[PDB]
Ligand SMILES: Nc1nc2c(ncn2[C@@H]2O[C@H](COP(=O)(O)OP(=O)(O)O)[C@@H](O)[C@H]2O)c(=O)[nH]1
């Protein structure tokens with residue numbers, strides 16, 4: 001089996017931990033969500049290769065932010081997340097996440113991930129964003145950002161419905177390889 005280190009980053013509450021959990025446990029967490037997922041190695045088969053993915057969760061609330069840069073050494077692939085229900089989180093991709101990741105992880109491939117895709121057509125989300133003269137992130141905007149930061153790929157998923165979750169890790173593995 002091939003061994004790869006994956007680091008997930010992006011704005012607070014954009015769904016990083018839930019994404020890791022749904023991929024690892026095949027269940028969206030109702031009941032409890034930790035700030036960061038437990039130390040975990042996932043198994044995935046991609047293109048007839050067995051690979052082990054160390055899943056490094058990160059966060060931003062006070063202490064985890066200082067811990068975050070210490071997590072970048074020897075990363076093989078980055079999941080760089082924003083939430084489709086948060087245009088703000090998308091704008092933070094070129095302003096915060098890409099400068100940080102490019103600094104600590106030169107040459108490391110990035111999968112730009114649009115989380116919470118289930119909220120794109122959500123009435124409540126649309127009404128809330130409408131008061132800001134905003135709307136959920138369009139897939140074309142996701143793609144354009146991926147192009148702009150020279151991501152390896154752009155993917156959308158919903159940890160909540162599981163839609164697209166497996167492909168995120170499959171693409172990340174292919175990049176990591
Ligand atoms: N609607 C929806 N909510 C989600 C999804 N993933 C996570 N959430 C919610 O978003 C919040 C933040 O999730 P979390 O994984 O802790 O985000 P993190 O801070 O980036 O690790 C929680 O209230 C989750 O239930 C999703 O795919 N769809």
Ligand SMILES: [Mg+2]
Pocket residue numbers: 016017018034035036037057058059
């Ligand atoms: Mg988290």
